[PDB]
Design a protein around this ligand. Sequence first.
Ligand code: HAS
Ligand code: HEM
Ligand SMILES: CCCCCCCC/C=C\CCCCCCCC(=O)OC[C@H](O)CO
Ligand code: CUA
Ligand SMILES: [Cu+2]
Lengths: 167, 31, 554
Amino acid sequence: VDEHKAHKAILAYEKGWLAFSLAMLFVFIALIAYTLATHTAGVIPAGKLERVDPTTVRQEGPWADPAQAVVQTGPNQYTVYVLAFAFGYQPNPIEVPQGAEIVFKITSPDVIHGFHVEGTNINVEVLPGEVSTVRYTFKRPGEYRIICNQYCGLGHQNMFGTIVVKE
Amino acid sequence: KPKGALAVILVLTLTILVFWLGVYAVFFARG
Amino acid sequence: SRVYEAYPEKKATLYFLVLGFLALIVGSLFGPFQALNYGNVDAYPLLKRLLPFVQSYYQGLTLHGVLNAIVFTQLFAQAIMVYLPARELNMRPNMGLMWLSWWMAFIGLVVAALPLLANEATVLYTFYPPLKGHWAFYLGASVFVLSTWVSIYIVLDLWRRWKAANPGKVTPLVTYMAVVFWLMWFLASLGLVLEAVLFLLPWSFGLVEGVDPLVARTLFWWTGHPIVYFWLLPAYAIIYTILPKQAGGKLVSDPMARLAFLLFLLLSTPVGFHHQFADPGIDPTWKMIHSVLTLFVAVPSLMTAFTVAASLEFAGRLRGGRGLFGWIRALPWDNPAFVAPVLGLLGFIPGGAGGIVNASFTLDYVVHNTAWVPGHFHLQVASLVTLTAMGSLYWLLPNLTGKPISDAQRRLGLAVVWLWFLGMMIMAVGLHWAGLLNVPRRAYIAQVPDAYPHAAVPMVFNVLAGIVLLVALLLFIYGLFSVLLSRERKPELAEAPLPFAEVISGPEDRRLVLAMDRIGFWFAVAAILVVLAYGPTLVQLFGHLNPVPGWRLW
Ligand code: HAS
Ligand code: HEM
Ligand SMILES: CCCCCCCC/C=C\CCCCCCCC(=O)OC[C@H](O)CO
Ligand code: CUA
Ligand SMILES: [Cu+2]
């Protein structure tokens, strides 16, 4: 029948479509796996549970003195202890050299904040009681804006920070 | 043969590819 | 009438639908104001005069997300995925449980609503700790969602009774869809129920001092992905089993329809880390595994695209359409019940494309928590699911009320559905484009008018969308109340059968359907996948709990 011929012709093309579909998704998985094997994967947060007490992080430890928050931990590597709080970032500004690997260690003494550096793939959630660790290397010197992109209360839309990358 | 259906899945496929490859490029430009 | 005595499930279904549409209206009021905000126009001083209980942008955003995305979507799912299988089997659901489910939904909604309206739960529809809402918000939300466990029972009951009266027969298609839908939702729902019962309820009552925000988010997104397939599948049921008849054709494949719904049972729940790519404390290995599984959840929709397009082309040909594109012109573009879901499917193409980008792990760092994400999801739920619901008013409402649709109400419906679709498409351009310029989501940006100058052009699209969708909503309100409050009635509209489509069958079809009818086996497989996908991470997190104090920052 006309309809029997349609069922058969429709399923025939539908089987090719499904084969093409899977092939396409497999190619996407290969192209993602590639990004995980390059330097660009440093923006993925460390999977380690690094617990802190949000009630003492401003009183004791590496977040307590923002002026000593940038530390040389390697020959071309700096670790930055960043506090995201209602409603700002410390230190402000963050001052780092061009071309060095920057390990950002970010926590909150209050609620969840975002840490999104305009012009980069640095885009990480900051949970109180937890440390978010991400790595990045700035190629160009200048001013990069930090945007809080997680709703943190009525000050959210004004919560901005500054990274200065020096030649 | 379902030419019309094939035209729709051609438009879907190109939309997926322009979106995915566009952002893949943006990811490397910001990396 | 005597109709509600024979078919009392019609009265209960109507109560679900109307409560759903009322929630959609109140939630949607805030939309145009949010679009004007993403256009750098602050209209909130005007809104506060109209609705003086509104204290802030974020309180409006909470009402917007909760009423549209949680309340309206659930009530629509409860109406469609109980009533359609009941009518396919010609069997009466347990009307005691059915009324109980409605009263639970109604009480939970009133209780959740009070603190929302009084500015005591300005925490948004994700309510991420340690932002601490009033206990009534979490209690109300909990009772509202648990309504659906009664709905699961009602349909497993209908199916059990049917199989007992018909041993040896395969489940009918619509009942098959509803059964796998409700079993998927049972597995899905456990994340949020565990979060509410173990953490949010004791915390909000003062019985525990803190909550671990990483465990809270992990449990939330267990439910938080599959809840969007919970929104979607009632629209898919209508698009598969009803749209084809309305278009003048048939469903080209029963087995291909069943396969798509089975794949959603297996793959909808074990993927939630695609909401946690930017979370600390979750192993990248598990992120890559949830990413891969997320790309597989896309397959049923890739399949749906072909089966439905093939079904509409078939209808076009039957009606004398010729060529690559003549089948399109031959379709009933004068019928709002046809147009609404089809425009929804057109917007779903770019919508699905954005979803696949979002799913691809490292690509999410480009768009996470930007205006991109609301751009993506308005095409999925605010356009396809909502337009398919709006279209149902033209065939479902008469079937429940005996109230006919006048030709004028039909013409108004075509205008509403076109303006709604066009507004969502314009807003999608503005939000996708603002997102790639790093404009954040969930932000009163109109209060920092100098912060995002690079986004001036996309912001014009957001104002235009704001105005178009304000007009579409006002027309929708006028039209809905016109149909409800109209005095004319024709009872034997209410006695008519639903426009269920016929199916084309093949020699192949019976073997595939028996394989898929082993629902006990398939549910077991789905349950194990949840255990494998979540179990190891939850053991790690529960071993290292770090509860933190709550904050009110509004
Ligand atoms: C109903 C509601 C939704 C659906 C459906 C949905 C589908 C997907 N989404 Fe999504 N989504 C994500 C990935 C996906 C993927 C891979 C799919 C897939 O299921 C999509 C597959 C779809 C397709 C492949 C399209 C098929 C096309 C069809 C079927 C059209 C055919 C047309 C025809 C037949 C017309 C022909 C007619 C003619 C006349 C020619 C990710 C990441 O992986 C995030 C987190 C991002 C971040 O950073 O926060 C996310 C975020 C969201 C959020 C925000 C949560 C929040 O508030 O934080 C919501 C509400 C949402 C809703 C929905 N989403 N999504
Ligand atoms: C007139 C119709 C609508 C307009 C103009 C509109 C506009 C918006 C805009 C601009 C946002 C983003 C605001 C922000 O991130 O701060 C938003 C958020 C949202 N909208 Fe809509 N919307 C409409 C209808 C709907 C419908 C029908 C649904 C669901 C059925 C929906 C679900 C959502 C959700 C879930 C959010 C996110 C809430 C959150 O981030 O906490 N919207 N809406
Ligand atoms: C029928 C034909 C059968 C043949 C099938 C072939 C399909 C292979 C597809 C993709 C290749 C993946 C390429 C991986 C290389 C990545 C390179 C890249 O993206 O590099 C840009 C960036 O600048 C770096 O830092
Ligand atoms: Cu910090 Cu928003
Ligand atoms: Cu999801």
